[PDB]
Amino acid sequence: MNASEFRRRGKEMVDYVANYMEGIEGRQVYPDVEPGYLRPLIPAAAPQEPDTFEDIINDVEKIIMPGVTHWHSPYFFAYFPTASSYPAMLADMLCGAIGCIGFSWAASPACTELETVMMDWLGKMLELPKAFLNEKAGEGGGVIQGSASEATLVALLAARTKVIHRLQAASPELTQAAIMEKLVAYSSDQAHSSVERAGLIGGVKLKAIPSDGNFAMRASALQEALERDKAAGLIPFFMVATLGTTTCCSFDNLLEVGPICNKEDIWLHVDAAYAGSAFICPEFRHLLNGVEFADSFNFNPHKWLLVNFDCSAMWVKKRTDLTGAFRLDPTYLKHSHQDSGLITDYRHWQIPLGRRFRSLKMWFVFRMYGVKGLQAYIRKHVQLSHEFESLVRQDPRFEICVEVILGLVCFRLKGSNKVNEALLQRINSAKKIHLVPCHLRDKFVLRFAICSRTVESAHVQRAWEHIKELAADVLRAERE
Amino acid sequence: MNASEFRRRGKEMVDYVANYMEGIEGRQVYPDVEPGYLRPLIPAAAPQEPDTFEDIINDVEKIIMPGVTHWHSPYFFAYFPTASSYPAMLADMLCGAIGCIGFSWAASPACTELETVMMDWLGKMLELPKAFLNEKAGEGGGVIQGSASEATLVALLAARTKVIHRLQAASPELTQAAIMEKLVAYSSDQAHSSVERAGLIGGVKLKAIPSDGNFAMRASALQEALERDKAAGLIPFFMVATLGTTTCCSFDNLLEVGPICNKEDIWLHVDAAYAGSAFICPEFRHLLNGVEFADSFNFNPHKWLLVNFDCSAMWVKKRTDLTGAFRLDPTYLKHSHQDSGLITDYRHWQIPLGRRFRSLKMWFVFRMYGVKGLQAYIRKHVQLSHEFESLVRQDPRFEICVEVILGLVCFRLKGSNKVNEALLQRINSAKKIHLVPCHLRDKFVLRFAICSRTVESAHVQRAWEHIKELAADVLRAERE
Ligand SMILES: COC(=O)[C@@H](Cc1ccc(O)c(O)c1)NCc1c(COP(=O)(O)O)cnc(C)c1O
Ligand SMILES: COC(=O)[C@@H](Cc1ccc(O)c(O)c1)NCc1c(COP(=O)(O)O)cnc(C)c1O
């Protein structure tokens, strides 16, 4: 295809995207397809001769769309929100056009330099401590990561490298493997699965700290675990404190855990993938207090800040902890400005080497929406979460398991876990709304998450009507 | 922004992208900016109120474009090509529109099911052994990875998990750390920096196998290294054989190394990031012979197959080696069809959890170009590489260090490394063309890579004229 053909087809794809978004409420949020639906509907081999764009866009509606779970339908209340903003889509078109692979500054200076300033913009929006900000002064800085799971793994690998060199400095004969056998990392019992995967990838032991009644990590439980493990020969090195847990959007206490991790020389990484976007609002910034004790902080703008996937923002106190570890400098990836402190090569900050101009999406979203526009988007979602909470609190057959703060409501029918599992099956079978469950201790709990950018008060009210209607049918069958 | 506004601005961005591509030859391939250029040109904080789209697109030309190294200019001959095709750009617009985070099949069935069939399409285009193909039969399958560096790390982590369980099965008292101390992996001395980073991340020792006169790994050198290391207590477990090396596009011998790795129970991963795209042409498929002995194979369609970054294709013989390792099954990521063999959850195949609908780009590129269209794109680039080779072979002042096969020419002025380093400095200072160097043993060697999709015979001829003119100036200064 040439450019003149892309002018026509590209503007047609713009119309198809806008039409799909304007009629997404007419779409069923969850598909009716069964596993293995797509392969019988398309040929087994690639076409030797070119197919037409009209046949491809027809196959999108006929084959692809039926097997699509619409994350951006207003009736999608599953997991956590994912970002869909038109400014980010416009920037992705320019990003693919420039087509730069910015592993180094020489690969494309604008790709690296725009990312560093955008991380300052975001850091100042969240009112982060100045130690995390690279304002052409200071040892800290930020980087776009592909995912919060990758950012957690990168933080663990940097902590593992630092503790190995410290222990080998004290005991030069100590081998790395013997250190690895005693290394232990910590997380909450409400932590995301990325923490355990990172520990399994890093070859280190991971232990879960018991949470309190509010499902938050406290200083007492951490001190009890450190007391047991250090007496057993284990060397704590890494800690993941979670703000806005996947289960119930609970918040670990950084003011209690932070100072403990600093005394114990434990690297403190803060995982606030979902809740981090709300910290640009001053009413929720108090939940971030204690990040000054953290060595690394990460949140996902591709969740609740309208910067389409992929975009994960990660700041560090000392860049040399990241740039010094896993450092390779091949001649084919060398340039003359590598030693300049004004810039950097983000390849050392990430597991991959290649990377794209993702900072254009942050630039576009921040400028076209503004800080006040993003703050209004956050507050409308939290207001809608409290509106769903009010409806549940008006029915004595239901109960709210955890305090509602930032767009997630954990609710359940009072009684067995079987009656709540039956209600979820009825909901997902009707396919009018989409919700996902969680397990708080031994309790089966349903989750209601405000996700879509176009969600309104009407959609939440209709979803509660659907849940209340199915609850009576399920509660009736329990009495028979 | 709403959809009606995106209709206008989106079609304007289509025009800007097409205009940039049609006038990319008027752009200087390498920027004249210095490090730290971008921060003084934009505000230090995000705008509280929204900025206009006209001011943003103006800042793209005024600020962003001067700091852009144009990978898709015909005069870009640096590193290796990166993919820029309009069909992939159209699919990326639809991918961001659907906005699915397909960590599971329930997240969006079409995202996972289309990817599995596209990997079969590609595998059959490369005429891969049927063991790597998931055609709803067999234990093998393919997955899109974010990068070849990530695919190499994933293969090493799966090999590390398998060797640990085998050794612990033979010796139940053996701890993992003691096994890690003896684990050693292997690669060529011409291997990419991703192999060493993967070994550093995996906490295992990595050793380089000496290459022959053609810079290829041979059975004799591998047997000598295995003989030394196994006598020293080291346990070989992982091997990365490279097809199309970053340095000189050399090809390791899989027919020699493969059977050795199978006897030694060494996981064999094949890294063919750049050269893998040419294997869809039957004249180059002989270079892939021996992949039948490999446990994993990876190549980058985001290099030489017009599928824009990111897209890395990785096949495996046994999916359970990947899906079994680092397996986590939280209730919030559970669905009812997880146990179906007709589908899968690609989250276990990758370091991250989230992923986007990247298989749309493979679908669009394969259908709009066709197999014959992609084969013609490969052969035109190889023809242009042989044309540059012919020009160098007509000048006795120059020499070709390695055989030219698949789009890369390694050349240098006969004599010192200082005269070739001076020639490269003159070339990159003139900014008319962009080339990068490499080191073959102790020899400084310049590289010429056919990169742009719009490159023609005229561009290569003008680049050789520029190199020949600067060579005489540099050779003159050496005699003074
Ligand atoms: C809530 O369910 C979880 O599995 C994820 C789902 C999810 C939601 C939205 C996006 O965009 C997404 O990528 C994943 N919320 C996850 C989560 C992660 C996972 O980070 P990445 O998906 O790897 O970026 C990490 N930490 C926390 C606290 C999470 O909730
Ligand atoms: C040739 O220089 C190398 O650093 C890379 C550069 C490069 C070129 C094009 C794209 O798209 C790119 O992402 C990187 N060629 C690299 C290379 C890799 C790196 O894989 P990823 O960049 O992580 O996908 C791996 N293996 C080989 C053999 C390479 O040549």
Side-chain angles (χ1 to χ4, degrees):
Chain A
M1 182 180 299
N2 62 66
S4 88
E5 306 167 300
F6 173 74
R7 296 181 187 267
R8 170 209 185 168
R9 302 305 187 180
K11 298 178 185 189
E12 295 172 359
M13 185 63 93
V14 166
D15 279 329
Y16 182 88
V17 166
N19 293 336
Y20 162 74
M21 280 293 163
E22 289 189 326
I24 201 174
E25 285 190 46
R27 304 254 181 192
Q28 180 180 285
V29 55
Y30 191 81
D32 281 317
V33 297
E34 304 290 328
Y37 92 97
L38 193 128
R39 190 185 290 272
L41 311 181
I42 59 171
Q48 293 280 323
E49 293 292 344
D51 292 336
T52 71
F53 178 82
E54 292 83 353
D55 179 46
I56 296 164
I57 197 72
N58 179 80
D59 290 337
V60 175
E61 277 291 336
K62 298 251 164 97
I63 309 171
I64 308 302
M65 281 296 161
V68 161
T69 316
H70 302 264
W71 278 65
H72 307 117
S73 157
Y75 302 108
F76 181 93
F77 309 107
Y79 317 109
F80 272 142
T82 196
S84 188
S85 82
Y86 298 119
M89 307 180 61
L90 300 168
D92 251 337
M93 302 164 64
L94 177 63
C95 176
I98 298 169
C100 49
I101 312 301
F103 38 74
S104 71
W105 179 89
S108 277
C111 180
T112 287
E113 296 207 23
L114 184 64
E115 179 167 324
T116 310
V117 182
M118 288 303 102
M119 297 297 288
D120 294 328
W121 278 22
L122 197 47
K124 299 172 82 154
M125 292 174 62
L126 279 83
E127 301 201 61
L128 284 185
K130 301 292 145 172
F132 289 107
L133 272 51
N134 177 98
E135 288 173 295
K136 290 179 174 173
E139 323 170 57
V143 60
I144 298 174
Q145 296 280 2
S147 72
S149 307
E150 287 163 271
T152 293
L153 176 60
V154 167
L156 181 144
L157 294 168
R160 189 190 67 184
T161 302
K162 175 146 100 156
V163 67
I164 285 169
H165 296 172
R166 169 167 58 86
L167 300 182
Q168 282 179 344
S171 300
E173 87 289 352
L174 241 187
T175 199
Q176 167 164 298
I179 292 170
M180 302 269 284
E181 189 157 18
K182 305 302 181 175
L183 288 187
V184 58
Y186 292 112
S187 69
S188 167
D189 51 13
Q190 310 302 127
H192 189 266
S193 49
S194 48
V195 191
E196 173 151 37
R197 285 184 108 253
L200 293 166
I201 292 167
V204 296
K205 300 167 175 58
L206 194 281
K207 290 179 134 67
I209 307 301
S211 54
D212 61 357
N214 301 320
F215 291 94
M217 180 186 298
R218 309 301 303 278
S220 62
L222 173 57
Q223 286 155 338
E224 180 164 0
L226 293 173
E227 190 168 309
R228 158 204 71 213
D229 299 325
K230 296 193 306 179
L234 297 182
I235 300 175
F237 79 105
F238 194 59
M239 155 74 74
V240 167
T242 301
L243 298 179
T245 51
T246 291
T247 52
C248 49
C249 194
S250 75
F251 296 86
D252 295 340
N253 197 323
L254 306 185
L255 301 172
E256 295 185 355
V257 174
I260 297 184
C261 292
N262 297 161
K263 301 181 313 180
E264 295 276 343
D265 217 50
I266 296 175
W267 184 300
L268 170 57
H269 174 71
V270 171
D271 183 4
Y274 164 69
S277 302
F279 299 157
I280 72 169
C281 300
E283 58 268 28
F284 307 119
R285 181 53 179 78
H286 71 277
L287 306 162
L288 188 54
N289 293 338
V291 69
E292 51 272 13
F293 315 119
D295 305 289
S296 50
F297 166 76
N298 173 248
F299 95 94
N300 286 341
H302 62 227
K303 274 179 148 55
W304 209 12
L305 215 57
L306 298 178
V307 183
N308 304 352
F309 191 88
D310 48 324
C311 180
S312 184
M314 180 185 186
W315 294 265
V316 293
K317 288 252 196 69
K318 288 189 169 208
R319 310 180 302 262
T320 53
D321 291 332
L322 275 63
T323 65
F326 321 108
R327 171 108 178 182
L328 271 85
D329 201 20
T331 314
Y332 48 83
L333 293 172
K334 284 180 192 167
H335 67 86
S336 345
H337 300 290
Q338 290 180 147
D339 218 44
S340 167
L342 295 163
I343 53 98
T344 180
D345 294 350
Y346 280 136
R347 56 205 286 274
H348 311 107
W349 305 53
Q350 51 176 31
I351 301 275
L353 178 89
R355 58 206 320 275
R356 47 201 281 254
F357 209 160
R358 293 173 293 193
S359 42
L360 289 171
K361 293 179 299 181
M362 300 171 73
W363 204 28
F364 279 41
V365 169
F366 294 163
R367 295 182 67 182
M368 307 199 84
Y369 271 99
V371 176
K372 290 204 247 152
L374 294 171
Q375 289 171 317
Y377 156 84
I378 296 285
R379 289 156 175 165
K380 180 182 172 185
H381 274 192
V382 180
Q383 170 68 23
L384 291 184
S385 188
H386 290 307
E387 289 176 22
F388 179 83
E389 168 194 13
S390 173
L391 297 173
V392 182
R393 295 195 178 281
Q394 292 168 35
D395 198 324
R397 304 173 289 169
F398 296 82
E399 49 177 343
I400 308 281
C401 301
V402 190
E403 180 184 359
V404 181
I405 298 175
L406 278 184
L408 181 69
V409 174
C410 290
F411 67 107
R412 72 185 298 267
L413 276 168
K414 292 196 195 148
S416 69
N417 291 342
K418 188 186 201 253
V419 60
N420 287 287
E421 290 161 329
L423 178 58
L424 180 77
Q425 163 258 310
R426 300 266 162 107
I427 290 164
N428 290 335
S429 298
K431 314 239 168 49
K432 303 214 217 298
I433 59 171
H434 196 230
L435 275 60
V436 299
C438 75
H439 272 94
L440 296 176
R441 315 271 190 246
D442 46 20
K443 188 173 56 173
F444 185 87
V445 175
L446 307 181
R447 312 166 67 262
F448 193 89
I450 311 300
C451 296
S452 182
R453 181 180 53 87
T454 61
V455 71
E456 305 285 356
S457 298
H459 306 115
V460 183
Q461 295 163 12
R462 301 200 186 110
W464 170 245
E465 169 190 348
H466 182 62
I467 296 164
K468 219 171 63 171
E469 178 179 310
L470 295 183
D473 300 6
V474 164
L475 282 176
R476 197 100 291 160
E478 206 193 20
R479 301 285 280 125
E480 73 96 6
Chain B
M1 182 180 299
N2 62 66
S4 88
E5 306 167 300
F6 173 74
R7 296 181 187 267
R8 170 209 185 168
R9 302 305 187 180
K11 298 178 185 189
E12 295 172 359
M13 185 63 93
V14 166
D15 279 329
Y16 182 89
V17 166
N19 293 336
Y20 162 74
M21 280 293 163
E22 289 189 326
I24 201 174
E25 285 190 46
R27 304 254 181 192
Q28 180 180 285
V29 55
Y30 191 81
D32 281 317
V33 297
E34 304 290 328
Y37 92 97
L38 193 128
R39 190 185 290 272
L41 311 181
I42 59 171
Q48 293 280 323
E49 293 292 344
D51 292 336
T52 71
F53 178 82
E54 292 83 353
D55 179 46
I56 296 164
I57 197 72
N58 179 80
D59 290 337
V60 175
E61 277 291 336
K62 298 251 164 97
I63 309 171
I64 308 302
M65 281 296 161
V68 161
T69 316
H70 302 264
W71 278 65
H72 307 117
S73 157
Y75 302 108
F76 181 93
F77 309 107
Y79 317 109
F80 272 142
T82 196
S84 188
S85 82
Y86 298 119
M89 307 180 61
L90 300 168
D92 251 337
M93 302 164 64
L94 177 63
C95 176
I98 298 169
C100 49
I101 312 301
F103 38 74
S104 71
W105 179 89
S108 277
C111 180
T112 287
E113 296 207 23
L114 184 64
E115 179 167 324
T116 310
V117 182
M118 288 303 102
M119 297 297 288
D120 294 328
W121 278 22
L122 197 47
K124 299 172 82 154
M125 292 174 62
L126 279 83
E127 301 201 61
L128 284 185
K130 301 292 145 172
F132 289 107
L133 272 51
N134 177 98
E135 288 173 295
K136 290 179 174 173
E139 323 170 57
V143 60
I144 298 174
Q145 296 280 2
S147 72
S149 307
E150 287 163 271
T152 293
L153 176 60
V154 167
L156 181 144
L157 294 168
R160 189 190 67 184
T161 302
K162 175 146 100 156
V163 67
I164 285 169
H165 296 172
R166 169 167 58 86
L167 300 182
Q168 282 179 344
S171 300
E173 87 289 352
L174 241 187
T175 199
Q176 167 164 298
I179 292 170
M180 302 269 284
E181 189 157 18
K182 305 302 181 175
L183 288 187
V184 58
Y186 292 112
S187 69
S188 167
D189 51 13
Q190 310 302 127
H192 189 266
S193 49
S194 48
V195 191
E196 173 151 37
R197 285 184 108 253
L200 293 166
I201 292 167
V204 296
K205 300 167 175 58
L206 194 281
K207 290 179 134 67
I209 307 301
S211 54
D212 61 357
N214 301 320
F215 291 94
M217 180 186 298
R218 309 301 303 278
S220 62
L222 173 57
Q223 286 155 338
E224 180 164 0
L226 293 173
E227 190 168 309
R228 158 204 71 213
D229 299 325
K230 296 193 306 179
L234 297 182
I235 300 175
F237 79 105
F238 194 59
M239 155 74 74
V240 167
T242 301
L243 298 179
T245 51
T246 291
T247 52
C248 49
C249 194
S250 75
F251 296 86
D252 295 340
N253 197 323
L254 306 185
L255 301 172
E256 295 185 355
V257 174
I260 297 184
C261 292
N262 297 161
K263 301 181 313 180
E264 295 276 343
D265 217 50
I266 296 175
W267 184 300
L268 170 57
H269 174 71
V270 171
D271 183 4
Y274 164 69
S277 302
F279 299 157
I280 72 169
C281 300
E283 58 268 28
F284 307 119
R285 181 53 179 78
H286 71 277
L287 306 162
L288 188 54
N289 293 338
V291 69
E292 51 272 13
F293 315 119
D295 305 289
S296 50
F297 166 76
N298 173 248
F299 95 94
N300 286 341
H302 62 227
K303 274 179 148 55
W304 209 12
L305 215 57
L306 298 178
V307 183
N308 304 352
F309 191 88
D310 48 324
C311 180
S312 184
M314 180 185 186
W315 294 265
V316 293
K317 288 252 196 69
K318 288 189 169 208
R319 310 180 302 262
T320 53
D321 291 332
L322 275 63
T323 65
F326 321 108
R327 171 108 178 182
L328 271 85
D329 201 20
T331 314
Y332 48 83
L333 293 172
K334 284 180 192 167
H335 67 86
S336 345
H337 300 290
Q338 290 180 147
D339 218 44
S340 167
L342 295 163
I343 53 98
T344 180
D345 294 350
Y346 280 136
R347 56 205 286 274
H348 311 107
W349 305 53
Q350 51 176 31
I351 301 275
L353 178 89
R355 58 206 320 275
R356 47 201 281 254
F357 209 160
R358 293 173 293 193
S359 42
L360 289 171
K361 293 179 299 181
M362 300 171 73
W363 204 28
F364 279 41
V365 169
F366 294 163
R367 295 182 67 182
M368 307 199 84
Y369 271 99
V371 176
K372 290 204 247 152
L374 294 171
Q375 289 171 317
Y377 156 84
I378 296 285
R379 289 156 175 165
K380 180 182 172 185
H381 274 192
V382 180
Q383 170 68 23
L384 291 184
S385 188
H386 290 307
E387 289 176 22
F388 179 83
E389 168 194 13
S390 173
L391 297 173
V392 182
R393 295 195 178 281
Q394 292 167 35
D395 198 324
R397 304 173 289 169
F398 296 82
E399 49 177 343
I400 308 281
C401 301
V402 190
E403 180 184 359
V404 181
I405 298 175
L406 278 184
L408 181 69
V409 174
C410 290
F411 67 107
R412 72 185 298 267
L413 276 168
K414 292 196 195 148
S416 69
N417 291 342
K418 188 186 201 253
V419 60
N420 287 287
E421 290 161 329
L423 178 58
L424 180 77
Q425 163 258 310
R426 300 266 162 107
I427 290 164
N428 290 335
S429 298
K431 314 239 168 49
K432 303 214 217 298
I433 59 171
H434 196 230
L435 275 60
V436 299
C438 75
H439 272 94
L440 296 176
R441 315 271 190 246
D442 46 20
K443 188 173 56 173
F444 185 87
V445 175
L446 307 181
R447 312 166 67 262
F448 193 89
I450 311 300
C451 296
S452 182
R453 181 180 53 87
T454 61
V455 71
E456 305 285 356
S457 298
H459 306 115
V460 183
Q461 295 163 12
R462 301 200 186 110
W464 170 245
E465 169 190 348
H466 182 62
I467 296 164
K468 219 171 63 171
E469 178 179 310
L470 295 183
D473 300 6
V474 164
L475 282 176
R476 197 100 291 160
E478 206 193 20
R479 301 285 280 125
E480 73 96 6

